[PDB]
Amino acid sequence: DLPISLLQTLAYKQPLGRNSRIVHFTDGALFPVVAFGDNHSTSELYIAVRGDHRDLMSPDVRDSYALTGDDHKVWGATHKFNVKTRTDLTILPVADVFWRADGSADVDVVWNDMPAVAGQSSSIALALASSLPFVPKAAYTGCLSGTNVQPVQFGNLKARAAHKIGLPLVGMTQDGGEDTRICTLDDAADHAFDSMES
Numbered sequence: 428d429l430p431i432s433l434l435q436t437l438a439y440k441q442p443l444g445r446n447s448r449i450v451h452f453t454d455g456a457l458f459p460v461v462a463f464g465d466n467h468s469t470s471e472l473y474i475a476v477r478g479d480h481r482d483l484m485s486p487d488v489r490d491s492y493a494l495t496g497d498d499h500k501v502w503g504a505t506h507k508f509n510v511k512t513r514t515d516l517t518i519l520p521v522a523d524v525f526w527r528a529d530g531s532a533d534v535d536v537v538w539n540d541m542p543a544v545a546g547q548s549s550s551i552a553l554a555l556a557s558s559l560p561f562v563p564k565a566a567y568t569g570c571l572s573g574t575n576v577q578p579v580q581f582g583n584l585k586a587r588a589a590h591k592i593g594l595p596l597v598g599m600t601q602d603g604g605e606d607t608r609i610c611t612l613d614d615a616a617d618h619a620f621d622s623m624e625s
Contacts, residue, residue, distance in 0.1 A: 432601075437468045437584060441591065444471075444522040444537030450483065452476055453531045454559055456619070457524070457566040457594065458552035459585035460544055469541070470581075470588040472566055473518045474534055475501070475549060475556040480517040483536055491543035501553065505543040509571045510550045512557035518544060523592055530561030530623055547571070548579040551598055554612055555619050563619030565589070568605065569598035574612040 455476040462469045481489050481502055492500040494507040495516075501508070502517040520539040526532045550571035555563060566589035570577040579585075582604020586596040595606035597618055609615045 439584060440467045440469060442469050442471045442539040444520060444539050446538040448536050449533050450536050451533050452562055455562050456552040456556040458549045459566055459568055459588040461581045461584050462541055470584045471539060472521050472588050474521045475516050475518045475552040477514045477516050477557050479515055483519055485538040488543050503543060505545045508547055508550060510553050512553055514557050516553055516556055532562040551615050555616060559619060561623060564622040565595045565597045567598050567615060568600060576610045
């Protein structure tokens with residue numbers, strides 16, 4: 428059958444991030460990462476960057492990867508993805524992000540002791556990160572079907588992670604939690620470039 432929409436109260440904490448290093452990225456895309464235990468739920472940003480930045484991961488996540496739809500690796504992510512990236516990517520938890528004047532950013536990369544990231548709501552970030560020469564000021568969420576976005580659960584808790592550092596949640600969620608709704612990959616790259624203005 429199809430879903431029942433139900434309301435659920437969640438106890439949310441922010442990840443304590445550890446082993447903090449400011450690194451300068453000329454490119455990468457942000458996306459939200461949610462997890463649930465007995466007790467508490469978490470919402471955080473991670474940054475997807477093209478190439479292998481394994482050196483920047485915790486050891487406890489370094490060996491984990493998912494395949495992209497053209498057989499590349501996304502280091503830090505768990506099972507193929509729909510998305511075709513023509514590059515490996517690595518995703519990293521981040522506590523904050525300081526843009527420079529040129530579209531680049533100093534990104535506080537952290538260790539959170541979370542497991543490898545499951546699910547495909549990162550697909551929009553993957554895409555932009557595999558193609559853009561700048562760090563869009565926004566976080567992205569949405570699974571991909573070809574170039575059509577599909578809506579993800581947890582929009583509202585996802586938006587928390589973005590708003591915590593002054594960024595919109597952009598993409599598509601089942602609960603309308605995004606600040607701006609974007610149904611295609613073209614519109615998300617349009618939005619990413621727009622995000623760079625003032």
